[PDB]
Design a protein around this ligand. Structure first.
Ligand SMILES: COc1ccccc1OCCNC(=O)c1cc(=O)[nH]c2cccc(F)c12
Ligand SMILES: COc1ccccc1OCCNC(=O)c1cc(=O)[nH]c2cccc(F)c12
Lengths: 304, 304
C-alpha cells in the first residue's frame, strides 16, 4: 500500500543524454541510433531569442559547429537538419545504449516522467502531466532545454516531450520528438498566453479510486449523480467535462473497488462543493489530477 | 523555476537489481561487486513469518537454494551469510554495472530516492523522507522487498535503505545495507508501534525558502520570532524543535533570499496557527516536509 507520484526508472533515458553546444549556447540532446535530437534554439544568441529567423541562423551553421559530447567522448556530426522546432544531428556512431523506442505525441491529461538534465548530465526524475492547456508544471533551470519526457512499456521507451522553454508565467512549454510544440507556443522570447487550464477530471477520479484501494475512504458518501449533473459542477469548478469514454477507462477501477463511477463522481461533487474540511487524501490536501487511471492500476498492481 | 518532488536518476541502481528466490519466496536483491544483498526474510514461509527463528531457518539452506537471477542470467552462489536482517550472497561474478558506492545510515528527516522493484525489475522511482519515527511512507506491494533507497553525489551512489515490510498501519519499515532496522522494528509479522511522528521543521522551512525562490510569496509576513517562541508553537503542532544546527543549515537559503531564518520561522508560525486559508504553496495545500535544505539548493541550482 501507499501512493506516490512515481516516475518511470530513468536508466534507458540516461544512456541517451548528450550535451550539444553551438557557438556559446549549451543544452541537452537525445542520442538514439545515429541521430541526436535537440531544441533548434541551440543555434540562437541573446539578440536572436526575441524573434529568431531559424532558417537564416541555421544556414550560417555547419556540421562542425555542433559540438556533441556523450559523457566525455565527442561525437562526429555528419549531417544536420531542422524538423519543425528540433534539430536532428546525424552522427557517425549509433548510440550503443539506444533502448527500444517510439516517438509518440501524448494527449492533454496524460502523464509522463521527465529526466531533467544539465550539460548532458541527468540531475533528477519526476512525474508530471501534460496540462489540458498544453503546458507542463515542471522544474527546470537554465540549461535544462532538451531534457525529455517519456513513458516506458516493459522494454520500450515512448518519448513524448522535449523541453524548450519557460513562459514568463513560470510554466513550461515544449515539443513532441518531431519538434511540434504542444499548444500554441512558439520558440521565441515573447509573452505567450497559455489559456485557461482545467483540472483533469478523469485523473482526479482515478486518484480517488487509488485512495479507496489504499484505505482513505472518509470522502465516500451515500450519494450518486448523473454525467449531466456532475458536469454542471465540473463547469463551475473548472474541471474537464466527464465523458462516457472517461467512464469506460475508469471501468477496471470501478470493478476493483465495487464503487460505480457515478457514485465516485458524487463523492467528487461533494468534495468540490464542500472542500476537504482540513482533512487529507493520500497525504494531499487538494484534489490530485496528475495520475491517470492507467497509472493508478500500474502502481496498485506492480507493473515492471 | 518550478518545484517538484524529484528523485535521483535511477540508472546506476537499476543495473544492480536482481531477483532472489528461496524456496517459494521471490524478492529483490542488490548486486554490488560479487555480493548480493537481500532481506533475510526471503528464507521464511508463511507459518514462519509470525515468529521466525532466522538462525535455524538459514541452517537448512545451502548456497544452491538461493536462486539469483540478473535479468535472464543466473548467478552462481558461492557463499551465504546473515548480517543483522540482511543476507549476503557471495556470487562468482562481480556485477559489471557496479557503480561507485557507499553504504550509509541516514538520519531521521533526511531524504532519499526509492527504486521500487518486483521480481528484480524496476517499476518506478520516487523521492521520500525517513520520518522522525523511522518509518517511510512509501508505495510498495507484495514482492517489493529488497527494493532500495539511495542518494547520488555525482558518480557515487550512497545506499541508505533496503525495504523489508509494511506495518499493519500501511507505513514502511526497513534497514540500512548492514541489515540494521531504522527504528524499533523487527522482521516479524506482528503489531509494531511506530511511535509519534512529527513534522520535519527544518525541511518545511527549506521548502518555504524554495517557495520564495520560485515566486510563491503570499505567506511572508511583517513578523519575526525567537527559537524559544517558535518551538512553543512547534511543540503544540507536533513539529520537531528547531535548533541552531537547523538554523545554520538554512544559512545558504537565508543568504540567497535575504530572509532571516527567524523571520521565515514567523511565517511558519502564522501558517501553523492560521492554516493556508484555502491557498496553496508550490502546488500544495499543506506544509511539505520531504525536502531538505540540501535538496532545495540542489533543485534550485541544477546539480547533476
Ligand atoms: C524565454 O526563453 C526562451 C524562449 C524561447 C526559446 C528558448 C528560450 O530559452 C532558452 C534557454 N532557456 C532555459 O535554459 C530555461 C529553461 C527553463 O525551463 N527554465 C529556465 C529558468 C531560468 C533561466 C532559464 F534560462 C531557463
Ligand atoms: C507483514 O509482512 C512482513 C513482516 C515481517 C517481514 C516481512 C514481511 O513481509 C514479507 C513480504 N512483504 C511484502 O511483499 C509486502 C511489502 C510491502 O511493503 N507491502 C505489501 C503490500 C501487500 C502485500 C505485501 F506482501 C507487501
Amino acid at each position: 500500500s501507499g501512493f506516490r507520484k512515481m516516475a518511470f526508472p530513468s536508466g534507458k533515458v540516461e544512456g541517451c543524454m548528450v550535451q550539444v553546444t553551438c557557438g556559446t549556447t549549451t543544452l541537452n540532446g537525445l542520442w538514439l541510433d545515429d541521430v541526436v535530437y535537440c531544441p533548434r534554439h541551440v543555434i540562437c544568441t541573446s539578440e536572436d531569442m526575441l524573434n529568431p529567423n531559424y532558417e537564416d541562423l541555421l544556414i550560417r551553421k555547419s556540421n562542425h559547429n555542433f559540438l556533441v559530447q556523450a559523457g566525455n567522448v565527442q561525437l562526429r556530426v555528419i549531417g544536420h537538419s531542422m524538423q519543425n522546432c528540433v534539430l536532428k544531428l546525424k552522427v557517425d556512431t549509433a548510440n550503443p545504449k539506444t533502448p527500444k523506442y517510439k516517438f509518440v505525441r501524448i494527449q492533454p491529461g496524460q502523464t509522463f516522467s521527465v529526466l531533467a538534465c544539465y550539460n548532458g548530465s541527468p540531475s533528477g526524475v519526476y512525474q508530471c502531466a501534460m496540462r489540458p492547456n498544453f503546458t507542463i508544471k515542471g522544474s527546470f533551470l537554465n540549461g535544462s532545454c532538451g531534457s525529455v519526457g517519456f513513458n516506458i512499456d516493459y522494454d520500450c521507451v515512448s518519448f513524448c516531450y522535449m523541453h524548450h522553454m519557460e513562459l514568463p508565467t513560470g510554466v513550461h512549454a515544449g515539443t513532441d520528438l518531431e519538434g511540434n510544440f504542444y499548444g500554441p507556443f512558439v520558440d521565441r522570447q515573447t509573452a505567450q498566453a497559455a489559456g485557461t487550464d482545467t483540472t483533469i477530471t478523469v485523473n482526479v477520479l482515478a486518484w480517488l479510486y487509488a485512495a479507496v484501494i489504499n484505505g482513505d475512504r472518509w470522502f465516500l458518501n451515500r450519494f450518486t449523480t448523473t454525467l449531466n449533473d456532475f458536469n454542471l459542477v465540473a463547469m463551475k469548478y473548472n474541471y474537464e467535462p466527464l465523458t462516457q469514454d472517461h467512464v469506460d477507462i475508469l471501468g477496471p477501477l470501478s470493478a476493483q473497488t465495487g464503487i460505480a463511477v457515478l457514485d465516485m463522481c458524487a463523492s467528487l461533487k461533494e468534495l468540490l462543493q464542500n472542500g476537504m474540511n482540513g482533512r487529507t487524501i493520500l497525504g494531499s490536501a487538494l484534489l490530485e489530477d496528475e495520475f491517470t487511471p492507467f497509472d493508478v492500476v500500474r502502481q496498485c498492481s506492480g507493473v515492471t
